[PDB]
Structure formats: C-alpha cells, structure tokens
C-alpha cells in the first residue's frame, strides 16, 4: 500500500509542475529569512552594546560633555539608519516570497485534487456491477470524501512547509557554524532531545483536531444502534439497561480521555522545560565564553538563536513527512481504482448497433454463479426462447433462477458457460450502452432522485420535450394524480421533499421506462410489495405498457400471469415445464401447487452548570496566573541578562549575576512544567467529567423523550449521535477553557503593559500601535500550522449529496445508464467551490505573508525609535529590550494562547443546544412512576373513536373515529387499503402518542392513567424485519423481559415454541453464538423466529404481530408460521395481516380504509357479504 513518489505526481500538467517548482524555490528562500534575521539582530545588539559600554565608560568627563556623549550616540543614531533598511529589506522580501510559496502550493493542489476528485468519481461510476456487490457501499462513499480529502492535505501545503522548515534547518546550521562553531556543537550535543521534544509537540499540535473520537467510537456505536432501533428499545424497556450499558462504555472513553489530556500536557511540559533549560545551558556557557573575551554578545545571540530555531525547525518539519506518507497510502487505493478496469465497459463504442430490432430472444445452456460465492451454483443448463411480442412469465422455487435471468439480460454479469442471444446475435458482441437503451427495467422497490418529477423524466432520457413527458405520464396512468399535487411537476421529491406512496413512485418509474421507448421490457417483482388497491391501476398501466413489446416478468402472486403467453417453472435453476396456463394446470406440477396455494450563551449559566467541581476550577485559576506571570518574567530576566552585558560592571559580579539569571531560567523551566502539567490536569479533568456527566445526562434525557420527538426531521439519527458526540466535547471549551484564556492573557499582557509603562512610556506607545497586528500574526500563524485555516469541509457538502446519491442508488443509475449526467453534475458542483478555493488561495497567501512581514517591520520600527531614545539619554537599552520583549513577545504569546485554545462561538452554540435539550420535559413521560398498575391480566382491549394525526405532517389526517373491541384469547386480524392507518394501531395501543379525541380502553380503564412501563410490560411486539442487537443469542432473546433475573433455562422454552431450539442445537456455540456483522448471518425467517422468542420470554397476555409481504425463504416460512400458531393459541392477539393464509382462522378481521372500518364478521361470513373481503379473496382467484 504505497504509491511511488513519481506515480503519485501523475495528474499534474505542464503548469502545476511550474507552480510547485517556483513555490519550491520560494520555500527555500523563505526558510532562510529568519536565521539571517537573527544575524542582523546580532550585529545591531553589538552596535548598542559597544556604544553603551563606551559612553558608560566615560561619564566622568566634565568639563564640556554636551557633544561628547551625544556624539557617542551619533555613532548609534546614523548606524541604525541602514539596519532599518536591512530589516525592512528582509520584510519586503519575505512579503512577496511568503506570498508566492503558499499560494503556489495551494493552487497546484487545487488543480491536482480537482482532476483526481473528478476522475475518481468517473472511475467509480465506470465500474462493473459485480465489483459493486463485493465492496460495501457506505465505506466506498466515505472513501470518496475522506480519502481524496487526505490526499489533498498531503499533496499541497504540508510539503511546502517541509522545504521551508528544512531550508530553515540547513540555513540555521550553516550560519550557526559560520558565526561560531564551538557553541554550535555545545547546542548540537543536546539538539537530538530538543528536536525530539519539538517533534512530539508539533505532532500533538497538528491534529489535535481529528483523533479525539476513537475512545468514544465504541460508546458511539452503542448510542447509534440504540437510537437507530428506538421503536424497539423504548418499546421493550431497557432504557435503564441500555442506559447502563452506554454508561459503562462511556466511562472507559472518559479514562482514555484523561490519559489523552495528561499525556498531551506532559508533551507540552517537556517542550517548555527543554527550551527553558537550553536557555540556561547556552546563556550559562555563552556567558562563560563572552566573559573570556572570545565571542561577542551579538555572536551568542546569533549562533544560539539561529541554531536553536534550526533544531526546532526539524521537529516543525516532523509531521509533514508522515502526512505525505498517509497521502501516499490513500493514493494507493484511489490510484488502484482509477487505473483499471471493467470487462463489460458501459462507456465503450466498440460493438455493432443493429437497428429495427424485433426482439427474438434466446438463452442457451447458461451456467452462472454470483461472484461473491463461487461454490453455490445458481443456474444450470437453462434454455429459453421467446419470440417477438410474446410474454413469458418465470416462476418456481424462489431464490434460484428468477431474478438472475433479468440480471443476465441487461448483461450485468457474464455467464460462465453458455450463450445469451438477442435476434440471433450474441449479446457480448453488441455495445453495452445500446443494449441498455433498448431494454426497460421496472424494479421491485421504486427509487426517485431528489429533484423534480420532470427532472426524473430527464434521467430517463435527457433530450425529452415537455409534451413527450406529458404523453409518457398519461400513458403510465399518472397524469390525473400528478396534476392534483400542490406545486406542479416542479414539486421536489426525494429525502428532502414530500413522500409519495410506493405505487405512485412505481408508476412514475414506469413513466421513465416508457420515455426510453424500449423494445424489451423486464419487470423484477414489480408488485410483490404493493397492496390490493394500487395493484389494479399498476397492473392496468403495465398491461398497457406490454402492448407490442417482448416482456420478461419475474413476480410472485401470479394472478394475471394466466393471460401471459407462456409460463416457465424453476427447480434448481432449471425450467422443467413450459406452456400456457391451462397446460400448467393439467400438468399438476409446481404451478398447480402455486395456484391451489393461491386459490444564546447566558454565560453564567454554563458556569452554574459546572458548579460541582469548583475545587478544580479554583486551583486552575490560581495556576493559570502563574502561567501568565512567567511570560513577562522571561522578558524581565532576558532583558536583565542582556542588560547586564551592556554595562561595565566588575567581572565577578557579571559572572554571579549571570549565574543568578541562568539558574532563574531553570527555575522558570521547572515552575513552568509543573504549572501547566497540573493546569492541563485540572482543566482537562474538570472538563472531561463535565463532558462525561453531560453526555450521560443528555443521553438519559433522550431515552426519556417520546417518539414524537424522534419523528422531527431536525432529529434524525445522524443529527442526534453527531449532536451528542460533538455538542458534549465542545461545551468543555465554553467554560473551562475560556477562564484559562482570559487569566493567562490578563496576567501576560496586563503585566507587560504595566512594567513596560514603568520603564519607558514613549516607546511603549509606539509598540502599542504595533501590538494588534503582531498578535493577529500569532493567531493566523497558529491557524496555518494547525491545518485549521485551510480545510472547512462545509462548502463541499452541497456536492456530496449527488455523490452519495449516485453511490447508494447504483443499480438504477446503471440500468438507465446515467453515469455521464452524474459525472457532469458532480463536475460543475465541484467547479464552483473550486473557483472559490482558487480565490481563497491568494487571500490566505497574502494575509500570511503580510502579517509575517509585520513582524519583521516591527523589529525595524521598534529599534529605530529605540535608538533615538537611547541617543538622547532618556532611556537605556535594557528598557527597549524590556518593553519590546514584553509588548511584542507578549503579543505573540497572547496570539498563540488565544488560538491554541478551542473556539467560543461553537462552544456557546453547543451549550445552547445541550442546555436546550437536557431540561426538555416530555409529554408522555416514560421515566415517571405514577399510575394505577393493577394485577389484572385479562386484556379485553377497546378502541373507542380514536382520532390521531402524525405530528411530522399534521395537515394530513390518518385516523378518524376508529373503534374496535378485542376479547380475551381470540384473534383479530386487520387488513385494508393504502393510507388506511393500519400500522398506527400498534403505535397508539403501545402509547407512543396520545389521540386528540376519542379514548383507548384497556380492560375498562383508560390507558392515559396507567403507568407506561407496566403497559409496555404486558405487550409483546413482533416487528416486520426484526432488529437484532450486537451481542450473543442469550441476551437478544433475553432482552424481551427486563427487570427480571431471567434464567438460562427459561430461554430454552421460548426457543422451543419459537422453533429454533432444534435448529440452534446444530449451530456452532448454541446459545452464546454471537450475532451481527462478524458472526453468522441468519435469514429473515430465522431472525423472525428470534423476534418471536424475544416476545415469548415476557409471556405476555397481548401479542402484537407486525408482519408483512413478502417471504421468499420457502424453508422457514412454514416454521415461522408454526411458531406463530403456537404463540397465538391462548393469547389475545392483534395481527397486521398481509398473508392471506393467516386470516381465515382469525376470530374477527377488520378492514380499515381512510381511517374507517367498513365491515365485520368472520372470514366466510364476510366472504358471503360479497364486499371488500370477498373482493380481496377474489383477487388471488385469478
């Protein structure tokens, strides 16, 4: 997994190589600016030191002295007239050089990652459909955003700072060795340790922003799986249990957070302990080297400052090589996708294009297996012919040969043996595209793309006129209801717009198939999922669509298949028998068995929120001042050591004053290491118990909130797991971090302003003019070096919608072959923020260049007027060092501090969300404890006139006056048409909502006065596709009854009546077998039996069976019906019914339509009624 460096630079034209060449040279001559800045600082401090020693020698020089000493400063006043020119030359050079290095690398990266991103979406959309099912689609989408964003970060900007920092290294040691080699080697003895501390500090500085959620990822997985499965976790109880389990995963993430923050502040503590120890070593040794008359103070500042910025420039270059290595590892599988290759190329123009095709269609001896598992054989020796205009319907045992025929006719896969022909010509010698345009597909579940109706007709064929769209919609029997919706064709559909029903989406999918005008029509289970009222109009539209077209239909419930020309039956991938309906009736084969089976801060509130661990805060405040105290203290002792070398004292008192100041550097180092070791410990631990307690309170709060709150489109699962995870770690910064900021800065700058005004006030006013822009330089440089000021990832979230849409709906976007239109839309949505990023690449280059240039110009302007003050004797040089080091270096420190800490806008909007959510009071309070709670177990249920509206769409009504009685032990099944409200009765009887009017009675008593946990304790729900949790078998079945000790033995009884015990007894690791993505994948029937067992552990007196069409399993269909029949024998049971075999034996069945019950009676009595029951039973009679 490693691209070579030259193979990575494959998408650069002739221009971008010139950009990175000129930006490389600009990196080289930008990196060498700062060490020669330390050179010029060395010469000027030799100017001031020599003139200060000469004038301070002869102050005993009366008579006349008014022009002697003033002339002794006429030395130093015309000499800095040219060092002001050197400083403004380095500044005016580093302005354009710093400009051209940063903007050129960002621009080369913008063009490269524009082409890599666009062509990577090309090469994903040009990939075969068998490769699609091997590789998980969500991970491929996350690869599309993440992996290209990673090669973006590695390719452009970090490897400009790499050459900058390495040129700073080699230039720093070249001028270090050419000024003085002795002290260069003395620092070079300890420079591995300095370089290592610098490297670890830079690496924890860079990010520092992304690797913070790995400890949380386990508990975040727990919270995600329970919020994804809300309607079974607030349904079975276990709010307390899953709350305990998330708490238990949460405390470990708290512990790893503690270890993270304490190791981060150890790693900063060794950094400042080593710069303030190397200050002591090099001013100690440089002192005992300039006291011998061997160096000068300008050499010691030059060679020491430049060598030490060199050693720290290494570690400044440390994370860039690893970001390049991560970029190269990402580019191995991006480049490995975009190189090569499909065998069936949907873009090529190679094969023939025969016109006026009639559709004589042939399968000959085809043998095929899916590429995910070669070992099972799906189709063996299959032979078919269907000639033009004829209709073949293919039926048999499900899962074998039905849908693979329609997936081979589109040439989605190549068969291993045999040949498939169209019109006598082999399909693998014709072009793939022209193949896919002459065939129209109608899938089982219809998909709509998030744009207008007419824009979905554009995807069918792009050059269609609006009149032809109107005729195609009229032919698809969709015109009258589409004229009735509020906006018009321009109505927005998708996940953002209004939600159409399944038959509606399906017949406009028919309208796409009709606008393509195909000669061959393929229908794969077009009406298995649809109810009895919409299937008539859909079957009318499909019977209109079949006129004049060769048709292949794969479908269950073969009611109208009789009219089709020939029926073909499958067994083991082989069609055993073929003919018209009546021949398959006389044969008494598979088909006759199927027909007889058929028939706002408020900031003080956040400190009040964190008003439990006040002792931490108190020690934190007392420790933060000590940080702010030691930043001017460095400028004080620094200007006292260079202030003791610009006077003329005794050699022994200069030796012992400099030993005092060197030791005091080391004391500053120790009392720095302790003070933000434990400052990081106390604000880190107070903020992390704040975020653990705040996560636990917000999650306990969210498990209480009703189903009404989860239906809110502002409250999908990504918004709540992302909101919880982000807005609990932010609010740590809203209180705990800001007091460290304000007290560090107020001691830092406050003390610097005060001591600087005491020692000389004019120069402090001048530097006070400079003090905003150089602190801006601190914050802008720290936002540059953290990687924060370049990435935003909120301008590409308008272009990730279409990419995500095209990856997830890839079967449809292949079967109508609109890879090209999606490449176009993604290309333009990529090109607008491309243009913006091209403009921003100049603005950030000029603000970084400009404000660095303000630092260099700031040296110039400070020391010129400093020379003028010193010249008229109304200051000294240690005072321009004290007020310059205090105001300026304090300004850099308040920039670095005020940027290294977290934000404050995101922190306060986060705390507005958290304290806006944790004090929310639910309507139907679940964690309450009042209620009647009787010991009755009869359970005669009675709905009386229930009126309900779903709160996500309160305009449309669903239930109006629904009344029905359910006696003890009997069975009521409920059926009806679409939009009736039949799925709502489970949610109303379980009291997810209360009705507006009417009443719900359990056992003569209104539910609204009973306790909700007891009510849900005596109800056993069995959902349609059962949700299984990520744990073993015994917990998933034992999850049924909580607040109980449940015995292991008790699991076995429920598994017996759920008919899995005999099947489990052959499974590996019978009862502690883990289930999920890693363990065995069970079929939908076996999982359905597991949900039956989970409902059977409770032994409830009411059983709610929520089951739906259709079951293709044919090996567990009968055992799930056996387990359901064993469960319903002596229990009051309400079933939402779609299988017609369960309803004959029910004691009563209820047909609901538009919230109204039409009629009642037994099955055969309502059959003799000759109404809706007899109509629904009469549909499958065909």
């Amino acid at each position, epitope marked *: 997994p490693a691209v070579s460096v030259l193979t990575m630079f494959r998408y650069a034209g002739w221009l971008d190589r010139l950009y990175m060449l000129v930006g490389t040279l600009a990196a080289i001559i930008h990196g060498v600016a700062l060490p020669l800045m330390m050179l010029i600082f060395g010469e000027m401090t*030799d100017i001031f030191a*020599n*003139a200060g*020693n*000469l004038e301070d*020698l*002869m102050s*005993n*020089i009366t008579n006349r002295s008014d022009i002697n000493d003033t002339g*002794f400063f006429m*030395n130093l006043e015309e000499d800095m007239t040219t060092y002001a020119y050197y400083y403004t030359g380095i500044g005016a050079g580093v302005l354009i050089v710093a400009y051209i290095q940063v903007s050129f690398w960002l621009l080369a990266a913008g063009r490269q990652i524009h082409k890599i991103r666009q062509k990577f979406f090309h090469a994903i959309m040009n990939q075969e459909i068998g490769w699609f099912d091997v590789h998980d689609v969500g991970e491929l989408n996350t690869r599309l955003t993440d992996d290209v964003s990673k090669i973006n970060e590695g390719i452009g900007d970090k490897i400009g700072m790499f050459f900058q920092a390495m040129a700073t290294f080699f230039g720093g040691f070249i001028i270090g060795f050419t000024r003085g080699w002795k002290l260069t080697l003395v620092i070079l003895a300890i420079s591995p340790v300095l370089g290592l501390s610098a490297g670890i500090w830079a690496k924890i500085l860079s990010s520092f922003t992304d690797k913070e959620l790995h400890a949380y990822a386990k508990a975040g997985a727990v919270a995600e799986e329970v919020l994804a499965a809300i309607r079974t976790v607030i349904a079975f109880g276990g709010q307390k249990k899953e709350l305990e389990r998330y708490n238990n995963n949460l405390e470990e993430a708290k512990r790893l957070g503690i270890k993270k923050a304490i190791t981060a502040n150890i790693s900063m503590g060794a950094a400042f302990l080593l710069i303030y120890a190397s200050y002591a070593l090099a001013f100690w040794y440089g002192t005992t080297l*300039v*006291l011998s*008359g*061997e*160096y*000068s*103070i300008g050499q010691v500042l030059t060679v020491f400052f430049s060598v030490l910025i060199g050693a720290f420039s290494v570690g400044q270059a440390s994370p860039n090589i690893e970001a390049f290595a991560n970029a190269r590892g990402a580019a191995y599988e991006v480049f490995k996708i975009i190189d090569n290759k499909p065998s069936i190329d949907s873009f090529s123009k190679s094969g023939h294009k025969p016109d006026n095709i009639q559709g004589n269609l042939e399968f000959k001896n085809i043998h095929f297996s899916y590429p995910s598992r070669k070992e099972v054989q799906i189709l063996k020796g299959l032979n078919l012919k269907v000639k033009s205009g004829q209709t073949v319907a293919l039926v048999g045992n499900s899962g074998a040969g039905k849908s693979t025929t329609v997936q081979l006719m589109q040439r989605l896969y190549d068969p291993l043996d045999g040949m498939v022909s169209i019109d006598g010509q082999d399909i693998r010698t014709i072009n793939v595209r022209y193949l896919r345009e002459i065939i129209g597909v109608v899938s089982q579940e219809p998909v709509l793309f998030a744009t207008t109706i007419a824009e979905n007709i554009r995807y069918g064929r792009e050059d269609v006129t609006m009149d032809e769209i109107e005729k195609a919609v009229k032919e698809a029997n969709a015109y009258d209801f589409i004229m009735k919706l509020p906006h018009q064709f321009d109505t927005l559909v998708g996940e953002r717009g209004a939600q159409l029903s399944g038959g509606q989406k399906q017949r406009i999918a028919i309208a796409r198939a009709l606008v393509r005008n195909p000669k061959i029509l393929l229908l794969d289970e077009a009406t298995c999922a649809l109810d009895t009222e919409s299937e008539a109009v859909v079957q009318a539209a499909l019977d209109k669509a079949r006129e004049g077209r060769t048709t292949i239909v794969i479908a269950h419930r073969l009611s109208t298949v009789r009219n089709a020309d020939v029926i073909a039956g499958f067994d083991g991938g082989v069609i055993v028998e073929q003919g018209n309906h009546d021949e398959l009736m006389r044969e008494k084969g598979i088909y006759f068995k199927l027909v007889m089976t058929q028939t706002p801060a408020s900031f003080w509130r956040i400190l009040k929120l964190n008003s439990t661990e006040w002792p931490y805060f108190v020690v934190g405040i007392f420790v933060a001042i000590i940080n702010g105290g030691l930043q001017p203290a460095f400028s004080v002792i620094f200007s006292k050591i260079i202030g003791v*070398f610009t006077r*003329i*004292d*005794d*050699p022994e*008192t*200069k030796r012992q004053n400099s030993n005092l100041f060197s030791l005091l550097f080391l004391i500053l180092g120790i009392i720095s290491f302790i003070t933000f070791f434990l400052q990081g410990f106390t604000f880190g631990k107070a903020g992390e118990i704040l975020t653990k307690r705040l996560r636990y309170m917000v999650f306990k709060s969210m498990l209480r909130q009703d189903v009404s709150w989860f239906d809110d489109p502002k409250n999908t699962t990504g918004a709540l797991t992302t909101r919880l995870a982000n807005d609990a770690a932010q609010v740590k910064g809203a209180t705990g971090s800001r007091l460290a900021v304000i007290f560090q800065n107020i001691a830092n700058l406050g003390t610097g302003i005060i001591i600087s005004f005491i020692y000389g006030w004019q120069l402090t006013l001048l530097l006070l003019a400079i003090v905003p822009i150089i602190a801006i330089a601190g914050v802008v440089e720290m936002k540059m070096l953290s990687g924060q000021a370049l990435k935003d990832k909120k301008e590409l979230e308008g272009s990730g919608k279409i990419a995500t849409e095209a990856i997830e709906n890839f079967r449809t976007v292949v079967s109508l072959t609109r890879e090209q239109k999606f490449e176009t839309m993604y290309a333009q949505s990529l090109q607008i923020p491309y243009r913006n990023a091209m403009k921003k690449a100049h603005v950030f280059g000029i603000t970084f260049s400009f404000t660095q240039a303000m630092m260099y110009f700031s040296y110039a302007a400070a020391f010129r007027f400093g020379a003028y003050l010193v010249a008229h004797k109304l200051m000294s040089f240690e005072d321009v060092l004290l007020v310059f080091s205090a105001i300026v270096f304090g300004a850099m420190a308040v920039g670095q501090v005020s940027s290294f800490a977290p934000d404050y806008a995101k922190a306060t909007v986060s705390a507005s969300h958290i304290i806006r959510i944790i004090e929310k009071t639910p309507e139907i309070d679940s964690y309450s404890t009042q209620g009647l709670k009787p010991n009755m177990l009869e359970g005669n249920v009675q709905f009386s006139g229930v009126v309900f509206n779903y709160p996500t769409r309160p305009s449309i009504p669903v239930l109006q006056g629904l009344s029905l009685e359910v006696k003890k032990g009997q069975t009521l099944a409920l059926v009806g048409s679409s939009g009736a409200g039949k799925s709502t009765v489970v949610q109303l009887l379980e009291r997810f909502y209360d009705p507006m009017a009417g009443s719900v009675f359990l056992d003569g008593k209104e539910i609204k006065q009973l306790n909700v946990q007891w009510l849900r304790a005596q109800l056993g729900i069995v959902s349609q596709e059962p949700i299984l949790f990520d744990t073993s078998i015994a917990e998933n079945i034992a999850y049924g009854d909580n607040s109980r000790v449940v015995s292991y033995e008790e699991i076995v009884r429920a598994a017996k009546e759920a008919n899995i015990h005999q099947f489990i007894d052959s499974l590996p690791d019978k009862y502690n077998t883990r289930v999920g993505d890693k363990g065995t994948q069970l079929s939908g029937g076996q999982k359905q039996r597991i949900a039956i067992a989970r409902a059977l552990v409770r032994q409830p007196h009411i059983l709610l069976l929520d089951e739906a069409t259709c079951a293709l399993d044919t090996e567990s269909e009968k055992v799930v019906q056996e387990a359901l029949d064993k469960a319903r024998e002596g229990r009051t049971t309400i079933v939402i019914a779609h299988r017609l075999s369960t309803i004959q034996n029910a004691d009563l069945i209820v047909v609901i339509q538009n919230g109204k019950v039409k009629e009642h009676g037994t099955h055969q009595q309502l059959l003799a009624q000759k109404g809706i029951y007899f109509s629904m039973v009469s549909v499958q009679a065909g």
Partner: antibody
Framework: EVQLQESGPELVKTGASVKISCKAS????????IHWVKQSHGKSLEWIGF????????FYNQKFKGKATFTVDNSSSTAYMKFNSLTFEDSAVYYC???????????????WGQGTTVTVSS | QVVMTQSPLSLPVSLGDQASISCRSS???????????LHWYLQKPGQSPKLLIY???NRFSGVPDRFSGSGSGTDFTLKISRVEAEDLGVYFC??????????FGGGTKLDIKR
C-alpha cells in the same frame, strides 16, 4: 597564543607625519579597545588615547588632541596611528595595550606590544 | 587625575628572598563597589610588559606563587617572596579607579645586591 606585535623603529624628520602600527594576532580582534600609551625616556607612562577597534570610535587625551590621529584596519587586523606635525618632544617609545570592552576600567590592560620607538630629528 | 607616587625608586633585592614594592596614590582608590582597582605589571627591556597582579590580591593565569600583593586605601604593596633570577625588570602600578587618564605609576627596577 595571544600576541600584539608592532612595527620597527622610526627615524622621522621634523614636521612630516609618521604612521605606526600594532598588528594583533591570536584572539578575537573585534572586541578589545586598543589603548595607545606613550613612554618618554625615564618618565611615567603617559596615556595617549584609545580606539574602540570594533568601529574606530576614538577618544583622545586632552594633551594629545589634534596632534595624534588613530585609525584601524579590520581586514588585516591591525591598528594604526598617524602622529602628525612632530617636534623633538615626540621622540619616545609607543605601546599598544588591549582592554576588554565588556568590562573596561574594571580589568587590567593585560597584553601589550613590545614598543615602537619613534626618533624625531631635524 | 590621581598622581601615583610609587615608592620605591630603585630596589636592591638580593637573590632568594623577599622584597616589597610600595604604591601610594594621592586619592582614595575605593570604588562604590567594595573593590580596589590597582594592577601591578612587570616589564623587561626589549619585550612587552606583562600583567602580574590585579585588584591588589588576585593573580593572573600563568604566574607562579612568588607574587602576592596586599594593602588597601591609599597604601599598596607587592611582595617578591623568594626571588629568582628570572624576574628582574621594572615593575609599575596601574591604574586610577577614576577614569579617563588611566594614570600609571613611575616604575621600580630590581637589582642583585652586590
């Protein structure tokens, strides 16, 4: 090894100038003041003046002001004085001493040239 | 301009014993720091003058233990303890602690005591 060697004896006629040199070798030349001191025959060591030797910032004694002029040469690391408008009272032995600039007045003139005798005649 | 009266004028030392040379200033050589700055130099004829003692009691890097000085205020003394035949030159006492003249002492030869 620290050595200040000086030029050879001079025999200059009255009135013309003479330029006398103190070549330094073995140390960091750019620090020490170079003091020029005068010794007559059998008298105390008179003090002529000094140079800052970093930038040539002179300071003359009040007696030897104008009729002595100091200068340096950084590249060859030498000091010089042109001692113009001679008289008979300027035939003497001239020395050069080095003083550390970092602490002058508080430290002895520790290394010395061997002395160049200037004999002024007519 | 403190005028130093270095009192010896010529000093007849014999060989292998101690002889003291006196330097008497005409102003108190006691600076504001509690340090007395006068310095003692050796000078042989033809060669350069060597620094010998500094700040009346200290000693310079490379000179043997025969040379030690004492005294304070305006009375100063260097001690030629156990004289060899190698140190026979003219000795003189720098400096004025009050600059700028850097007033030197006159001089003191040595001898053999025939």
């Amino acid at each position: 090894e620290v050595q200040l060697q000086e030029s050879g004896p001079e025999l200059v006629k009255t009135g013309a100038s003479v330029k006398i040199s103190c070549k330094a070798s073995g140390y960091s030349f750019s620090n020490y003041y170079i003091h020029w001191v005068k010794q007559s025959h059998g008298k105390s060591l008179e003090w002529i003046g000094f140079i800052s030797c970093y930038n040539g910032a002179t300071f003359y004694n009040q007696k030897f002001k104008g009729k002595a002029t100091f200068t340096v040469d950084n590249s060859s690391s030498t000091a010089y004085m042109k001692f113009n408008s001679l008289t008979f009272e300027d035939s003497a032995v001239y020395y050069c001493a080095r003083l550390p600039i970092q602490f002058g007045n508080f430290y002895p003139m520790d290394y010395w040239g061997q002395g160049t005798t200037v004999t002024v005649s007519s | 301009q403190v005028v130093m009266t270095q009192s010896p004028l010529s000093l007849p030392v014999s060989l292998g014993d101690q002889a003291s040379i006196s330097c008497r200033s005409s102003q108190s050589l006691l600076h504001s720091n509690g340090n007395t700055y006068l310095h003692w130099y050796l000078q042989k004829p033809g060669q350069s003058p060597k620094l010998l003692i500094y700040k009346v009691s200290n000693r310079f890097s490379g000179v043997p233990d025969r040379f030690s000085g004492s005294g304070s205020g305006t009375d100063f003394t260097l001690k030629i303890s156990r004289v060899e035949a190698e140190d026979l030159g003219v000795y003189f006492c720098s400096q004025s602690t009050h600059i700028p003249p850097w007033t030197f002492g006159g001089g003191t030869k040595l001898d053999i005591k025939r």
